[PDB]
Structures are given as C-alpha cells and as structure tokens.
C-alpha cells in the first residue's frame, strides 16, 4: 500500500533467523580496527536500537534471545582474546554504553532526569529489563578485571628497572600513554579510565617499595634521589593527561615517603622526629627495615646505628600498624562505574557496510 513520508525512529529490525548472523558480524568476528573512525560504541548503539525494535513489537523472545546471545558472544570473544588489551577495552566500553542506554531509556523516571523530550520518545514501552542490566553490570566488572590483569602483566617486568635502575622510565610512560590512547579512542568512560590508572600506579607503588624493603643494594641516598625524580615524571605525566583526580598520586605516597626517607639525615633525636612525622604512610616495620638496609655508597658515611633505630622504635610506640613488611602488589581497589547518560540522539546512527549488516532495516 501507499507509504507516508516516514522519518527514522531510531530502531533496527531483523528476522529471528538472522540473529546468529547479527551476533557473528557485530560481536564474534568484529575487529575494533574496522570501527575507526566511526562513532565510538557503535555496536552498543546498534544493539540498543535492535532491542528497542524488539520491545516496540512486544517480542519478548527476541529481546531475551538477543541479550543472552550478545552476552555469550562477548564472553566468547574475550576468552579467545584474554591477553588483548585493545579488544578487552573495546568490549568494556561497549558493554558499559549498552548498559547506559538500557538505564537512560528504561522508562524509569530516576534515570530520565538529564533526558531531553525527544530522547524520552526513545524509551522502552513494554519490557522491564532490570535482570539483564544486572547481568550486564556483572559482566562489565569481569571485563574490567581482565583489563587490569592484562595491563599489570605488561607493566610488571618494566617497573623495577624503570624506577630503581632493562627498562627506562620513558618506556613505562610510553606504555601508559598507549593504554590511555586506546581507552579514550574507544569511548571508555573517563571515570573508568581514572580508576584504571589509580590501580596501575598502585602496582608501581607496591612493586617498587617491596624491592626497597628487601634489597640493601637499592637503599641509598642516591637511589632515593633518583627514585623521587622518577616519581615526579610520573606525576607530571598524570597531570598532563588530566588523570590527577584519579587518586593515582595518592597511591604512591608510601613510595614517595620511602624515597624521601632515603635522603633524610639519620643521626639525631631531631632527625628521628623528622622521619616519624614524615613517614605517616609507612609502618613502623617498613621504616625500621629501610633504616637497617640503608647502605652508604662511599666509606665516608656510616650505616644507621642500632641506637638510632631504637630511638625510632620508641617514637613510634603509639602505632599499631599492620604486620607484614611487604605490600600486596595484587591488591585490587573496589570500583564503581556510574550511570553516564549521553546527549546523543539515536536518530542519527549510520552503519558502515564493512560491518556487513545490510539485512537490518531501519524503522
């Protein structure tokens, strides 16, 4: 019959027999490479547009099957690419954006407060997808855990030589810059980006301090001076990238204090008092260890005396502190990925033919 002049509603329709193909071409076989320079998180937007048509047509089987198959496809891709930072970051970003869409367009007033009138026209009408959002939320946490695992594994061999000693600092920074560039390009939430680097800089803090707590060959005034300089370059890199609100600098306070301790005078009651008031982020045990390990680099200086160490120990009596000497390098900070509604209108999503998704027609 005769058709009206109909404009795009921002929905994408497909036949149920083509779902396996959709999941194949949009998830299973998708390479992040191909998607530059499209809109970032294009798969999340296409996926929501499909879910929205399923809801529009009151098709709860299509809704259930699509979501379930998407979640399974993503887990399959990530198990296959379990050492791939880019691929892992790519699906974190899209899993998050898909979850944001399902919240922002849930139809629940508590999520629709930054929504424009037209955006509200794009809300789901039939289905409450609360259980699927919970699954997507659990999934984003698991993908983030893989991302940290990958990034820490890459950084691990670089740390000791970059901070104390083979790798240079510039190599560490180049790696950090690589990680950051990928996450930005893929549209990962800046709040998640902040939490990633907080985590990685804690690992630098822990691994480097553990080396100072066990090895006399690095506990010298010279190392402390060089270490403090290296940490300052990291801080400058962080500020230059607008990552200084991440909490990353704070995670390095123990190491910073260790580097300064190595440079402080270590002879008098006054010297002892200075060390105690400065080293508020080092336990009594850690401070005493570094003082014991401390080795002058020429015969013109002596080692810290037993008397001095006992003076330190008496000044720190009021402290309980933990117990173990070393820091857990694998400590993971709890995270929160907040709801991040976008000002984007689904009404304007164009789909490249390299995705091979022409069978999806526009409603």
As to burial, measured by CB atoms within 10 angstroms (0-12 exposed, 13-18 middle, 19+ buried), residue 210 is middle
**How far is residue 58's CA from residue 22's CA, in Å, rounded to a whole number?**
20
**How far is residue 139's CA from residue 357's CA, in Å, rounded to a whole number?**
25
Q: Which residues make beta-bridge pairs with 361?
A: 13
**How far is residue 230's CA from residue 258's CA, in Å, rounded to a whole number?**
13
- Technique behind this structure? X-ray
Q: Which residues make beta-bridge pairs with 11?
A: none
Q: Which residues make beta-bridge pairs with 285?
A: none
Among 145, 156, 235, 143, CA closest to 186: 143
Å resolution of this model? Answer: 2.1
Q: Are 148 and 84 in contact (CB under 8 A)?
A: no
Q: Which residues make beta-bridge pairs with 13?
A: 361
Task: Fill in the DSSP letter of residue 6.
Answer: P
| Tokens 């010279």 belong to residue | 222
Q: 163: left (phi > 0), else alpha (psi -120 to 50), else beta?
A: alpha
Contacts of 215 (CB under 8 A, 6+ apart): 293
Euclidean distance between the first and the last CA atom of the chain, given in angstroms as a whole number: 17
As to burial, measured by CB atoms within 10 angstroms (0-12 exposed, 13-18 middle, 19+ buried), residue 87 is buried
Residue 270 CA, chain-centre distance (Å), reads 43
| Tokens 């390299």 belong to residue | 354
Among 25, 31, 66, 28, CA closest to 47: 66
Residue 12: phi, psi to the nearest 5? -130, 125
Query: Measured over all CA atoms, what is the biggest interatomic distance in the chain, rounded to whole angstroms?
Result: 99
Distances (CA, A) of 140 to 35, 76, 93, 97, 131: 21, 14, 9, 10, 14
Helix (H) or strand (E) holding 12: strand 12-13
Q: Which residues make beta-bridge pairs with 12?
A: 362
Two structure tokens written together for 221:
């005034």
Contacts of 9 (CB under 8 A, 6+ apart): 347, 363
- For the chain, what's the residue count? 363
């Amino acid at each position: 019959v005769q058709r009206k002049e109909k404009d795009f509603q921002g929905m994408l329709e497909y036949h149920k027999e083509d779902e396996a193909l959709l999941i194949r071409n949009l998830v299973t076989d998708l390479k992040p490479q191909m998607l530059s320079g499209t809109v970032p998180c294009l798969p999340a937007y296409i996926l929501y547009m499909c879910i929205r048509h399923a809801d529009y047509t009151n098709d709860d089987l299509k809704v259930h099957s699509l979501l379930t198959s998407t979640i399974n496809g993503i887990k399959k891709v990530l198990k296959k690419h379990n050492d791939d930072f880019e691929m892992t970051s790519f699906w974190l970003s899209n899993t998050c954006r898909l979850l944001h869409c399902l919240k922002q367009y849930s139809g629940d007033e508590g999520f629709m407060t930054q929504n424009t009138a037209k955006q509200n026209e794009h809300c789901l009408k039939n289905f409450d997808l609360t259980e699927y959002r919970q699954v997507l939320s659990d999934l984003s946490i698991q993908i983030y855990q893989q991302l940290i695992k990958i990034a820490e594994g890459v950084l691990q061999p670089m740390i000791v030589s970059a901070m104390l000693e083979s790798y240079c600092l510039e190599a560490i920074i180049r790696q950090m810059n690589a990680f950051h560039t990928v996450m930005c390009d893929q549209g990962l939430d800046p709040e998640i980006i902040l939490q990633v680097f907080k985590q990685l800089f804690y690992m630098i803090n822990a691994v480097t301090l553990n080396n100072l707590l066990l090895r006399k060959d690095v506990c010298s005034w010279s190392t402390g001076m060089q270490l403090r300089y290296n940490i300052s370059q990291l801080e400058e890199w962080l500020r230059g990238r607008n990552l200084h609100q991440s909490g990353a600098v704070q995670t390095m306070e123990p190491l910073i204090q260790a580097a300064q301790l190595l440079q402080l005078k270590k002879k008098t009651q006054e010297d002892a008092e200075a060390i105690c008031s400065l080293c508020t982020s080092l336990s009594t045990q850690q401070i005493v260890k570094i003082l014991n390990l401390y080795t002058p680099l020429n015969e013109f200086e002596e080692r810290v005396t037993v008397a001095f160490i006992r003076t330190i120990q008496a000044q720190l009596q009021e402290r309980n502190d933990p117990q173990q000497l070393l820091l857990d390098a694998k400590h993971m900070f709890p995270v929160l990925f907040p709801f991040n509604p976008s000002s984007l209108t689904m009404d304007s999503i164009h789909i490249p033919a390299c995705l091979n998704l022409e069978f999806l027609n526009e409603v």
